[PDB]
Design a protein around this ligand. Structure first.
Ligand SMILES: [Ca+2]
Ligand SMILES: [Ca+2]
Ligand SMILES: [Ca+2]
Ligand SMILES: [Ca+2]
Ligand SMILES: [Ca+2]
Ligand SMILES: [Ca+2]
Ligand SMILES: [Ca+2]
Ligand SMILES: [Ca+2]
Lengths: 20, 146, 146, 20
């Protein structure tokens, strides 16, 4: 089943890498 | 204490947002795609620089270990709050201090993820320590730490 | 606290001892090879079972994230000491309670690693908290923890 | 330069996986 915690953490980590 | 199975899955999810073709490697084209989706405008030479910093095997692309190394360097020393605040602003587009459900849906849509209203609400719930239905800066920070 | 760059490199080193052809995937043949080198005798069905427990993408081989998941499960709950003691015994071949330089060289040779006397001495030094020139059980444990 | 700590940790982790 969709794991919202994993989904949000993955998106946050991606956004951190995508930062200067 | 020990790297956990769930931590690994979180990293794998992040890797998959870049590796959209699921071939197991992140190219400069894929890096660029994600970054522009998040409102950034890296140049080609800047994308090359990012890959070269961690391209241990010199093959010009990023594999899983090299991606983890990129992450580990990013997450190392964040006390200035400069980087975290930059990432929060990606989500808090109106600058009001709270990531709304609508704002989270904007970012997930930009990242190419199809999600229902219920799924995105569950994401908010995961971060929403104070129960107000929105994610503040401290809640965002805690999602990386926690 | 955060997965570190050095932790990643340690995991990558372990992955490379299995992935001897450096193609980025561990096959059942490679799993078997390492295990037999370490005095084990897994059956084919046992090797398949190991891969199936973590083969998220169903491709019949182990990639980096799947390898990390295998590790994370192994390292999870080791308080019985059964597993750690089994690994220590691989190195402490004469059962005397201490991993000697010669014993470490035996295992590294079995794993296919070419090392000098100086390199292996440096390995002992890394684990050898009490300075006696050999690695005891508690020192071995601390190498995984530490 | 050869990193003995990484080398020994990698070998220990491999041996743990190679256990029952
Ligand atoms: Ca790709
Ligand atoms: Ca590479
Ligand atoms: Ca907002
Ligand atoms: Ca809140
Ligand atoms: Ca291989
Ligand atoms: Ca697989
Ligand atoms: Ca001995
Ligand atoms: Ca000692």
């Amino acid at each position: 089943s969709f794991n919202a915690r994993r989904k949000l953490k993955g998106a946050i980590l991606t956004t951190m890498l995508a930062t200067a | 204490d020990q790297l956990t199975e769930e931590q690994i899955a979180e990293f794998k999810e992040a890797f998959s947002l870049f590796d959209k073709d699921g071939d197991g490697t992140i190219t400069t084209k894929e890096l660029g795609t994600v970054m522009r989706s998040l409102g950034q405008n890296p140049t080609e030479a800047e994308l090359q620089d990012m890959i070269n910093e961690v391209d241990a095997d010199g093959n010009g692309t990023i594999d899983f270990p090299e991606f983890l190394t990129m992450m580990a360097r990013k997450m190392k020393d964040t006390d200035s709050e400069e980087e975290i605040r930059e990432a929060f602003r990606v989500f808090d587009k109106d600058g009001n201090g709270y990531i709304s459900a609508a704002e989270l849906r904007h970012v997930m849509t930009n990242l190419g993820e199809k999600l229902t209203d219920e799924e995105v609400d569950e994401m908010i719930r995961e971060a929403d320590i104070d129960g107000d239905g929105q994610v503040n800066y401290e809640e965002f920070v805690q999602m990386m730490t926690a």
